[PDB]
């Protein structure tokens, strides 16, 4: 469990969102591919601005993830220090 | 005749910025995938080497060797976890950057 | 005005099949991603449980936890790997399938 | 017995690699298509041909994907035969 899972989840999460973005883009090209240069400049602007927002959120989730990861490394350092004490055992 | 038309479309400059955008997306998808593959391979190598390790401790009695395996696997786990988070943060930064260049040049 | 135009495009049927192809690809990328995440979480869980088990040791009589978690971890990892291969084969099989209906319908 | 653990590492990576293989390639497909349309945006039999060629590309990637899944599953199944023998 723990931030390990949380991190793989954020990873896959971002992959998915980006794919849906590339799909939105591809569809938007095929349409119109079928007063229009106003809509072209608009399209480039809009897909830039959507990707931009997604990058904002990805970086926020990265920051929070780093926090939960702080909790976990606190938990792991106790496990490695128990390992050290036992390792001096025999 | 392919070359002239590709040059002139390259000169008009209409498909180039959009292709830049798609290209950028595909790249970040690729880099995220490779991060997930590396994480997965790391967790696998941990569980496997801990399994062989606990087996070689099975065929002895020293609780010290057991503790040394515990120490190694926990320490390397923290290692891998923090380095993975950092890799990801870098990926997110460089993506924000490339996007700001593309919006900037768009104007 | 959005509705009439999308109705007439869906009726012409020129942009629809290409969009179907793009949707096919996007869906398989999604499913492959989720399959990989599941695999990753599996290796993570099995590793971490065996770590907590090895941390619960001390007292040499604890070789029972050693053999039981080791046997459990090994056989369950067999399962995981084989079932993962099956999910992936299924995904590739079904991908083939939808491609063949799209080629078939594209011909006609 | 611990010897057998070597035989986990081959398919596991081979599995994980394969997954990511298929993801990359699919994304390139999604990319090529996504800018193929884009070229036609700057500009009707070219459309039919474009669809045919996308469907064919993806089909070939599919054959390859299914052959690699065959080889992998053979590795895993041989390895399971040996493991089910070793627990006996």
Numbering used by the authors:
A (entry chain C): 17 to 50, 60 to 115
B (entry chain A): 3 to 109
C (entry chain D): 3 to 110
D (entry chain B): 9 to 51, 62 to 106
What did the published study say regarding this structure?
PHAs are stored intracellularly as granules surrounded by a layer of phospholipids and several types of granule-associated proteins including PHA synthases, PHA depolymerases and a group of proteins known as phasins or PhaPs. PhaPs are proteins that bind to the surface of PHA granules, and can be regarded as an interphase between the cytoplasm and the hydrophobic PHA granules which functions in preventing granular coalescence. In this study, the crystal structure of PhaPAh has been revealed, and a mechanism proposed for its binding to hydrophobic PHA materials. Generally speaking, PhaPAh forms tetramers with 8 α-helixes in aqueous solution and two different types of peptide chains were observed in these tetramers, whereby a hydrophobic and a hydrophilic surface is present in each monomer.
PhaPAh native crystals diffracted to 3.0 Å, as observed using the Shanghai Synchrotron Research Facility (SSRF) BL17U beamline. After rounds of phase improvement and extension, model building, and refinement, the final structure was refined to a resolution of 3.00 Å with Rwork of 22.70% and Rfree of 29.50%. Size-exclusion chromatography and dynamic light scattering (DLS) analyses indicated that PhaPAh exists as a tetramer in solution and the final model in the asymmetric unit consists of four PhaPAh tetramers accordingly. The overall shape of the tetramer somewhat resembles a flat rectangular brick, with two short N-terminal helices from chains A and D protruding outwards from two opposite sides of the “brick”. The four monomers in the PhaPAh tetramer adopt two distinct conformations: type I, observed in chains A and D and type II, observed in chains B and C. When chains A and C are superimposed based on helix 2, a major conformational difference is found between types I and II, in which the position of the entire helix 3 shifts downwards in chain C. A very significant phenomenon, observed in both conformations, was the focused distribution of hydrophilic and hydrophobic residues on two opposite sides of the PhaPAh monomer. The formation of the tetramer can accordingly be rationalized the following way: chains A and D expose their respective hydrophobic surfaces to each other, while loop regions of these two chains are next to each other forming a shape resembling chopsticks. The still exposed hydrophobic regions of the stacked A–D dimer then recruit chains B and C through hydrophobic interactions to form the tetramer. The recruitment of chains B and C leaves no hydrophobic region exposed to the solvent environment in the tetramer.
